[PDB]
């Protein structure tokens, strides 16, 4: 329950920060939310900022993903479909990671630099998969860089889709496999 | 310069709302920033909520670009995206405030949604024209509108993810599948 308390505080951390973002959340509240003293949470994670990063360390993507290409006999479409589903599902399960990360990103906050490392491996697996598919002639795009940009931009911002209107994985796949007439 | 005064209030509201969000700003901070008393602000805008919306009206977002560009969807799109981009770069609070409203899904969203609505029906017409002239190639118009508006409306994302070619240029090359020139 030392371990349980810690998880409770982290679980709380994710919940509160998500509702109000970094500025607006207080340790008091997270303490309160996990049902422990302020003191305990400030001791275990030494302050707000560290507790903030620990939430990304704990709930982010950093060691969650296997090697999808390998796992899929190097069929790139299957590899991407599985990568995107696991990426979007991991966020759907911990949505603050995406909401908070996207905020820090569009605001280019000072926190961004120490948050990014919890995303970097997932972007670079995306790149490898896209490049293998391009190599095999199954994906077609003009720039790997542009493509990685629009894919991660919409995957990390699920709510923008509904706002825009009122299926994502297959739309990303259909976009990539479409071969231009030319 | 009663317009200049109103402007000052709008400028101050954008700035102050930008920094703390709708909840964490008040007419006092805004009024102070604009160097008028609250009564002046209340006079012209009557309340934080309405001020908020006036900011979007004042700073959100238009000519018909296919027409302005002789029914050429490439140039029409390049101009449209270039104007969209410049604007968001000068008015970054719009993006961040929109982000928060979309994320939080407040009543306020539906009122401010309108100040993007128009932009995106035009984007759509340009894309569809370019498809039929065979210069743009994409599987889904709606999926294309989606990732385009997503990356144009939050251009800082680009810099995080690129951690070396222009946003507008990259979008055009993605659709034409050709070097942008």
How would you portray this structure in words?
2 copies of one chain form a homodimer. With 182 residues, chain A is mainly alpha-helical. Chain A has 2 domains: 47 residues, Homeodomain-like (Arc Repressor Mutant, subunit A), CATH 1.10.10; 135 residues, Tetracycline Repressor, domain 2 (Orthogonal Bundle). Helix content of chain A is 74%, strand content 0%. Chain A has 12 helices and no strands. Chain A is elongated, with a radius of gyration of 19 Å. Chains A and B meet through helix 7, helix 10, helix 11 and helix 12 of A and helix 7, helix 10, helix 11 and helix 12 of B.
Shape of chain A: elongated
CATH superfamily of the largest domain in chain A: Tetracycline Repressor, domain 2
Query: Which range does the strand content of chain A fall in?
Result: under 5%
**Strand-pairing-aware structural class of chain A:** mainly alpha
The biggest beta sheet of chain A, please?
Answer: none
DNA-binding region (chain B): 26-45
Protein name (chain B): Hemolysin II regulatory protein
Keywords (chain B): DNA-binding
Domain HTH tetR-type (chain B): 3-61
